[PDB]
Amino acid sequence: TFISRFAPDQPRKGADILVEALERQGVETVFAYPGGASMEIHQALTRSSSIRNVLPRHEQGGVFAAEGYARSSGKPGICIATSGPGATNLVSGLADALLDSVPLVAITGQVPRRMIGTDAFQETPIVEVTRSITKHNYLVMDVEDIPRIIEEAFFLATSGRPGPVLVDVPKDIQQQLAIPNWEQAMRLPGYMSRMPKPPEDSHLEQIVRLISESKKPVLYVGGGCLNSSDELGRFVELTGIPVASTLMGLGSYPCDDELSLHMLGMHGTVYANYAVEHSDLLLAFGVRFDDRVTGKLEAFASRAKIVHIDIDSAEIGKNKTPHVSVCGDVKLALQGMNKVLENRAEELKLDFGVWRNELNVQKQKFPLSFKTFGEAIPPQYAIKVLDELTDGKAIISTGVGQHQMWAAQFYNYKKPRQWLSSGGLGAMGFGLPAAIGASVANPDAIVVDIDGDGSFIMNVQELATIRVENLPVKVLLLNNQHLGMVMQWEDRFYKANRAHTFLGDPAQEDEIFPNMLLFAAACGIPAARVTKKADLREAIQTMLDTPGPYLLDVICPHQEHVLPMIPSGGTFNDVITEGDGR
Amino acid sequence: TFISRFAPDQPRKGADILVEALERQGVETVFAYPGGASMEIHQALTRSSSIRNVLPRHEQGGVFAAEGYARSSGKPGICIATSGPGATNLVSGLADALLDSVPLVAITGQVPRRMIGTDAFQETPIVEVTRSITKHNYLVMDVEDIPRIIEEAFFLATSGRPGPVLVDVPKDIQQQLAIPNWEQAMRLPGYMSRMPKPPEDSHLEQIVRLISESKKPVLYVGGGCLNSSDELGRFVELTGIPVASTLMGLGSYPCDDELSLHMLGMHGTVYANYAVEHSDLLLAFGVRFDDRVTGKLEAFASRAKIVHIDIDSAEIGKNKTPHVSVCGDVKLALQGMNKVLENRAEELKLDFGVWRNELNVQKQKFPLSFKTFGEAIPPQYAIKVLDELTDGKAIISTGVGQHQMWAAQFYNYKKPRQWLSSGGLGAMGFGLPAAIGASVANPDAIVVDIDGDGSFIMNVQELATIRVENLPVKVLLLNNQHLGMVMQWEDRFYKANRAHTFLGDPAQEDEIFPNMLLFAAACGIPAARVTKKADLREAIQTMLDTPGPYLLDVICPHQEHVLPMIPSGGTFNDVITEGDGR
Amino acid sequence: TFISRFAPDQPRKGADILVEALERQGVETVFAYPGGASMEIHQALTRSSSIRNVLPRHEQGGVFAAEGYARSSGKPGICIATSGPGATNLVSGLADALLDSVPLVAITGQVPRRMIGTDAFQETPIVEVTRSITKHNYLVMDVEDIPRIIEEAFFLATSGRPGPVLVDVPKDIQQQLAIPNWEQAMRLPGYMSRMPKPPEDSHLEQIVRLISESKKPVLYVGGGCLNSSDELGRFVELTGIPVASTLMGLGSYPCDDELSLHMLGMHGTVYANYAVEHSDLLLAFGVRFDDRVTGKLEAFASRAKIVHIDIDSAEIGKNKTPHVSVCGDVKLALQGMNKVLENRAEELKLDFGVWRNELNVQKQKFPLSFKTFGEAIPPQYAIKVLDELTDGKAIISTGVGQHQMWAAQFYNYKKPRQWLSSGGLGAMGFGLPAAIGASVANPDAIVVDIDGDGSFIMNVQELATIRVENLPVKVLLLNNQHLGMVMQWEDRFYKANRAHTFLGDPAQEDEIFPNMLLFAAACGIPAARVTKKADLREAIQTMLDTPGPYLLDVICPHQEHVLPMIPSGGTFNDVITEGDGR
Numbered sequence A, B, C: 001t002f003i004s005r006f007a008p009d010q011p012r013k014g015a016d017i018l019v020e021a022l023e024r025q026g027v028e029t030v031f032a033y034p035g036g037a038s039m040e041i042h043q044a045l046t047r048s049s050s051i052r053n054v055l056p057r058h059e060q061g062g063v064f065a066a067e068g069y070a071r072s073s074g075k076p077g078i079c080i081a082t083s084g085p086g087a088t089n090l091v092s093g094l095a096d097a098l099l100d101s102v103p104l105v106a107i108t109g110q111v112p113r114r115m116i117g118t119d120a121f122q123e124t125p126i127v128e129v130t131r132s133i134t135k136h137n138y139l140v141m142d143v144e145d146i147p148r149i150i151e152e153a154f155f156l157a158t159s160g161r162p163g164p165v166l167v168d169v170p171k172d173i174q175q176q177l178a179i180p181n182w183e184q185a186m187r188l189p190g191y192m193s194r195m196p197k198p199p200e201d202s203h204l205e206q207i208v209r210l211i212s213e214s215k216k217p218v219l220y221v222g223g224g225c226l227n228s229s230d231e232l233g234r235f236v237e238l239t240g241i242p243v244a245s246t247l248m249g250l251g252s253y254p255c256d257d258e259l260s261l262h263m264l265g266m267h268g269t270v271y272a273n274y275a276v277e278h279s280d281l282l283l284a285f286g287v288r289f290d291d292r293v294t295g296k297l298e299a300f301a302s303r304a305k306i307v308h309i310d311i312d313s314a315e316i317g318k319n320k321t322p323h324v325s326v327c328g329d330v331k332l333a334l335q336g337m338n339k340v341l342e343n344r345a346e347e348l349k350l351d352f353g354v355w356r357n358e359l360n361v362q363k364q365k366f367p368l369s370f371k372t373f374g375e376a377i378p379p380q381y382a383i384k385v386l387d388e389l390t391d392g393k394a395i396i397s398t399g400v401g402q403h404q405m406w407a408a409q410f411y412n413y414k415k416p417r418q419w420l421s422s423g424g425l426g427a428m429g430f431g432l433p434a435a436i437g438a439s440v441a442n443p444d445a446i447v448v449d450i451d452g453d454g455s456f457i458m459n460v461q462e463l464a465t466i467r468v469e470n471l472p473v474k475v476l477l478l479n480n481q482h483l484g485m486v487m488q489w490e491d492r493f494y495k496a497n498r499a500h501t502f503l504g505d506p507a508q509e510d511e512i513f514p515n516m517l518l519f520a521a522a523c524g525i526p527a528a529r530v531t532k533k534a535d536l537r538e539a540i541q542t543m544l545d546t547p548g549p550y551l552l553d554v555i556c557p558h559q560e561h562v563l564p565m566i567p568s569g570g571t572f573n574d575v576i577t578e579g580d581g582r
């Protein structure tokens, strides 16, 4: 039973209705940046005693913070911006939330209804702009539609395949006095009719049947299993099938486990890719067969009977044609199959020890490796130390590039919603703001931003946000003085021809530029720099032990390469296993 | 006669064709940020010995730099980004360039043609996204269309009413070998047929006729007169008509002149607004009657016979219905009218001395003013000192807010393309990157970024760009520790109720946060802070005299208000002339 | 005070709400064709005792009948169709109503809301299809929105510049029981803010001023003056300015008048075109400067000071740049100028007798002419007889082609809304159904369809409608056994090379095919055929005197050409005055 700050018969501003509509959705935290078209909303936010506002220093930082908030909780992330320049600063975050299927609700202010289409001051058709990069969007044309639209927005953003939903609110609507109706039905008849219903026992036992008929099966786990950690692990026990996870699905099945093949794909482990290459049954649960995982589709799982389970019917038979398909929640599909496997453990032989040992050979023959040059810090080693000193219980957010891959390879995530990274869009400057949102959603948790110097500087302004909001955000900055991932492709495919990849100062080459420590000092954040591998262990320990925000500038040799690697649109027999830029 | 780096019969990469297509457009400088979808382009850029690339630390900084490059030269600004996150980081700059009619060409990398529509890695329908915020955009579907599209892009961006044009280039097109045809005709039959032709002598002498029949005329000059400085001044001599300029039209007519009414509008001078209010003839040249200038249209120039000249036919009769209209280049319209006025000076009485003295009374009665509290630095005074110490010859770029208005009020711009500011979209974080582009376009010029602490921090990362590129960018930072313009509306309309407008640290209120000096130090840029008005003159002098980049952190009392002010959608009799937040 | 068939607190079907919504708009007649998706609506129509339904035999006939109903009354025309094939059969009528600015409301049935987008049975995104060919359209997503949308539909269709408005209604919405709210406000804030307000006395007396300063003025009257017959005639008396009318503006000023220059344009009279060519003041009232009137714009009224009055701001300065422009209702503009001319008749000389006599010379030198070959009936002569025997008081609807032009040239329409013809779209098969709708709107009026054999046969099925509905529709069929207008262009520009223009039977060339008399007999309509000019007078008399429907098959020599003629994109000095296909 909800308690309002207004009488049921009392006229309220549209902005007040909007905020209460958020309160009724259980919203505790928003990321809002003020402007003329959304001042009424911010005024109403102050009148709320339940909704906290974290003020970013950039709306892109605001929406990315809403993502990190969402990714590390399961709750929808809410960001608010003003019209024009404020709204257009959300675009990258919206597209990012769409490709990674992150539940997010964005509210943008807008010019009065009378001025829409006249190219007015700070006017942008943000609905027209964001239609192709959001799950759905709205343009409120009446104050009475506010309670309904907000309900529809949160419903669409969280249910089915999660995604970003934008609600554009005119300024005059915010000012208009009205009495809200909270019991009006949602106008989504088509969407709800197409919502997948619980899986039939028909489909489920056919899959279980295929499991016993195949003796070389591989689990293909992705971001669709982020809410099925228990059911998935229970499924693995009953089957004994090795697990290959994606960039988006890390943590679903414990990376330190003996049945774990870790990440598969372009920069996935060799033994994971080998498993899929020589599998006869592929259990694709909560994935979307991205080109970064498959390469050339015709060779990907060529001899494998493919089973695909997804809550989105559009993803089924999209890139790779499956044998058996189940459209629905994989959480329920697991529960259904789990009850069958235990009640039918006798009839089913179920022993893939021979196949497991075949993979375990590859797991020892071609394992993840890195070189240690003198006293120079291996970035792979630094992340491994962070794992040990945090016991793999730290929430990790990253930017995009070489550091992103190493953070996914050399950290054993034990539970989902611990790994926050841009995979679909792969947007830089995601790391720091995402850490901000995750720290707010999880106050008592260890939050570490494993960032690259290129990505870190893009939204470096959010360091001020961290200090002001007093968030214990740790920044493990892997500094290679380059746009590493771009540099790596240059060494591999372009004769190491440097095309604007060096981030330092061409007047003083061996001086670290910029001085990231002074960035932290500018925002009153304690920081330190480590260059030698010996001091690395103590340095990271200091970062963790020191209360509040901390920046550790870890200097790494730039010639390092992310291995292994499969060139875009290739096969498993094209895997690069050795080499760098030395 | 152009000299290529390739033989006329030699097959070249599409990326090489693209770069040469830019070379044939006279492009000397681009602002490109590398990524997987645009690596071929960056490789081809290095092979060019005429095109220089300035590497930003953020694509938003890249496109804003392209704007400042364009705004301070008249040449089109070129920015290049990769697919996905790179392209979406250009959005704000594109929308900004559209609303301020700035000639700009944006080139974005894209996934191969075979992968368009599959929600691939780093894929965003940027054409679909930017259609409503660009003049025009393209999606290259063949390597043979590159020379034509690029020619059409630069033509559309610079001709008629200037604007942003985006060209999306697939990765496979960049790699495809081909022989370019540079003599293919442009496919713009409709656009060129609708292009305004030189004004008839019929329309022009009717305007001249109205000039003599009215004895209280006012010139309404805007951003359409940026290329008519000579013709406009010549026109004023022949007529003696007082000149009211817009935010976008500053510098067209010298602000220090005795016939100058300076800026009109919401934050325009009282005597400028009074002139338009009590005019009988309004000469609207190169304007678009924005709501920030007119307020309520019915009261704006209510008793004035309105003459409107614009190169865009869609702007004629859009918001305010004109009496006489001339669709075409105002530069030619002035030249046509100028030759008439001098050859017909005898018949025409032409003496508005009585009307001029009527306005000159208002010019002394209600002039621009500011208070000086103790030793606290008035932001209005600081800008006035900068004017004196630069002799009004310094290129000024600003952010958005209170500092933006004061920089437009208390600096006398003598020539156009000296005032760089976001007016239509009004996007923060514009100041610093725009100064970067302007410094590249004008190396020997004094470039000063009059920025606010809120706007400055948004794209603060571009400080690294300034140092690396060794640009003599001066940063006059007016620090009020607040989002001032938002704070001002709070003091005026919301009982001074602070709704997330304070930018400092709520743990140490009277400490300046963040320490902007350390931001500059992080990027090896010399910086200083001044608090007392006495030290202000020497401090600004030091900033100017010190070679290379410099940051001056000017501390200002936050209670200051931009005056005068007309509330949104008001009349001239609603002007606020006194008051602040004390 | 409206009287409902339902209690204010009684739940009603959505279809019943829809019909009552029409009743509250004063709708007396609809043109509906039944289908599965609109059965509920047709059931509700029978429950109404005020709304009459005319059942067409084709939905294209239905919408064209709604046009004729609208064009000959000023009231909006209402047509109803089912989903899929029914809706797509309205398309031509919708596009036709848009280009001729005809007030029309189309209601289409639709699949249930749950099935929209699944390519269901008889599903077509008719909103998506008709968006570019309607003024506005709706998709009802809730039964509660029915009273509002219908009100907005009729308001948009009739106010401002009239046009077609489509309302798509899902089947489940029609079945859903609800209690309608008739006092809900319309959601058109932007549209109403942009609605032109009454013309200022400022603009009006400037026009009156130009009238006295020019001694060779010409009135350019179009379809915008259809509701200003009295005001226009009063204006002519006060000025004495000759009147040139368009295809859409016939009847506004009496064609038989001595000040009438009749039609101008491609097939307009020579003296009308001469007037505009050598005018110094062009009073363009209620026109849109179509290419069929101007040809090459640069030569059209080259030496004339152009005054343009239109209720659509988008039409001002569209093709031809005007000197003086007044955005608003021309009816009010005339009233405003009329009161000035009479109160200021003394000061104004106002005597264009010299210019009038100059035109009157051309009016006698190059008049409308036709040849009479033996006893063969001249189509021009037949129409002239119809004029005499109906005293120019008969409502005339036509098809498209040679007969359409002759019906506009050789019939003197005394009042507006007497001339019904497709001008903008120029759609064949318009004649017969439009006559149907006009006969229903005007029962006691003489309605004659001057049709061509090609156009007549396209919607010949509506002959059944005429008989069933017992409408006194007269059909003056001008039979040339060819697609004449297409044939004429062949004789003029393609060496008389027949490219599928003959409509008869290539097995019996001099036999009239098809036998149109048997078409009439099939629908129980009395008909006759006349071939010799002598019998023509009595034959037409019989058609008029015979009660009820009648078809007169008038046989004409096909070699006749519409004269004069200006080739597409030409000038006045390119007028073809003599010649045919003999």
Ligand SMILES: Cc1cc2nc3c(=O)[nH]c(=O)nc-3n(C[C@H](O)[C@H](O)[C@H](O)COP(=O)(O)OP(=O)(O)OC[C@H]3O[C@@H](n4cnc5c(N)ncnc54)[C@H](O)[C@@H]3O)c2cc1C
Pocket: A099, A100, A101, A160, A161, A162, A221, A222, A223, A224, A225, A227, A245, A246, A247, A248, A249, A263, A264, A265, A266, A267, A268, A285, A286, A287, A288, A289, A290, A292, A293, A309, A310, A311, A312, A315, A328, A329, A330, A331, A400, A401, A404, A422, A423, A424, A425, A426, A427, A485, B121
């Ligand atoms: C530099 C870089 C390199 C990369 N290289 C790799 C790589 O080597 N390997 C790799 O794996 N990724 C890599 N990626 C990331 C890659 O681009 C994609 O992000 C990733 O492959 C997609 O992971 P996913 O399909 O498993 O999860 P998602 O993209 O999140 O897809 C989730 C799918 O599961 C479905 N789903 C969601 N919820 C449910 C539910 N409750 N029940 C059932 N189904 C559900 C959804 O409909 C959707 O189809 C890289 C990214 C970057 C930036």
Ligand SMILES: Cc1cc2nc3c(=O)[nH]c(=O)nc-3n(C[C@H](O)[C@H](O)[C@H](O)COP(=O)(O)OP(=O)(O)OC[C@H]3O[C@@H](n4cnc5c(N)ncnc54)[C@H](O)[C@@H]3O)c2cc1C
Pocket: A121, B099, B100, B101, B160, B161, B162, B221, B222, B223, B224, B225, B227, B245, B246, B247, B248, B249, B263, B264, B265, B266, B267, B268, B285, B286, B287, B288, B289, B290, B292, B293, B309, B310, B311, B312, B315, B328, B329, B330, B331, B400, B401, B404, B422, B423, B424, B425, B426, B427, B485
């Ligand atoms: C915080 C803030 C406050 C503001 N307050 C004010 C204010 O008080 N006063 C004010 O004036 N502005 C103010 N603005 C800016 C305002 O929003 C608009 O940017 C500005 O009013 C538009 O100026 P403009 O129409 O003259 O020039 P533009 O917006 O650049 O329009 C140019 C017009 O001239 C035409 N044109 C272009 N080239 C030619 C040519 N060669 N020949 C003929 N025609 C041409 C174009 O078609 C166009 O119609 C403010 C902005 C901000 C951010």
Ligand SMILES: Cc1cc2nc3c(=O)[nH]c(=O)nc-3n(C[C@H](O)[C@H](O)[C@H](O)COP(=O)(O)OP(=O)(O)OC[C@H]3O[C@@H](n4cnc5c(N)ncnc54)[C@H](O)[C@@H]3O)c2cc1C
Pocket: C099, C100, C101, C160, C161, C162, C221, C222, C223, C224, C225, C227, C245, C246, C247, C248, C249, C263, C264, C265, C266, C267, C268, C285, C286, C287, C288, C289, C290, C292, C293, C309, C310, C311, C312, C315, C328, C329, C330, C331, C400, C401, C404, C422, C423, C424, C425, C426, C427, C485
């Ligand atoms: C075979 C053929 C040949 C043709 N040849 C000719 C020809 O020779 N000569 C000719 O004239 N036409 C000819 N046409 C027709 C031509 O294509 C156009 O239909 C016609 O020229 C347009 O007439 P109009 O602009 O005057 O009226 P409309 O097309 O109906 O335009 C009405 C205009 O007046 C405005 N308006 C409407 N209501 C009001 C109001 N209350 N107050 C103020 N303004 C208002 C509207 O906004 C609009 O701009 C021909 C058509 C066909 C099929």
Ligand SMILES: CC1=C(CCOP(=O)(O)OP(=O)(O)O)S/C(=C(\C)O)N1Cc1cnc(C)nc1N
Pocket: A399, A400, A401, A402, A403, A404, A426, A427, A428, A429, A451, A452, A453, A454, A455, A456, A478, A480, A482, A483, A484, A485, A486, B033, B034, B035, B036, B082, B085, B086, B089, B122
């Ligand atoms: C420059 C760059 C990358 C280099 C990032 O530099 P970093 O310094 O942050 O990372 P790293 O050296 O450890 O690899 S990665 C990349 C990919 C994978 O497309 N892009 C393109 C890119 C460009 N701009 C944004 C916002 N996001 C992006 N991913």
Ligand SMILES: CC1=C(CCOP(=O)(O)OP(=O)(O)O)S/C(=C(\C)O)N1Cc1cnc(C)nc1N
Pocket: A033, A034, A035, A036, A082, A085, A086, A089, A122, B399, B400, B401, B402, B403, B404, B426, B427, B428, B429, B451, B452, B453, B454, B455, B456, B478, B480, B482, B483, B484, B485, B486
């Ligand atoms: C926060 C803010 C403003 C305050 C800017 O803070 P500043 O510190 O930079 O400027 P100031 O104190 O001197 O006034 S101005 C404004 C307007 C006029 O809409 N917005 C909204 C806004 C929000 N985000 C962006 C990118 N651009 C914007 N203009």
Ligand SMILES: CC1=C(CCOP(=O)(O)OP(=O)(O)O)S/C(=C(\C)O)N1Cc1cnc(C)nc1N
Pocket: C399, C400, C401, C402, C403, C404, C426, C427, C428, C429, C451, C452, C453, C454, C455, C456, C478, C480, C482, C483, C484, C485, C486
């Ligand atoms: C065939 C034809 C025409 C010939 C019509 O044949 P008619 O027999 O009806 O008319 P006519 O001989 O007296 O000239 S006119 C025309 C124009 C002006 O575009 N079209 C093209 C046309 C084709 N189809 C439709 C529905 N409408 C059209 N106007």
Ligand SMILES: [Mg+2]
Pocket: A452, A453, A454, A478, A479, A480, A481, A482, A483, A484
């Ligand atoms: Mg790096």
Ligand SMILES: [Mg+2]
Pocket: B452, B453, B454, B478, B479, B480, B481, B482, B483, B484
């Ligand atoms: Mg500030």
Ligand SMILES: [Mg+2]
Pocket: C452, C453, C454, C478, C479, C480, C481, C482, C483, C484
């Ligand atoms: Mg015919």
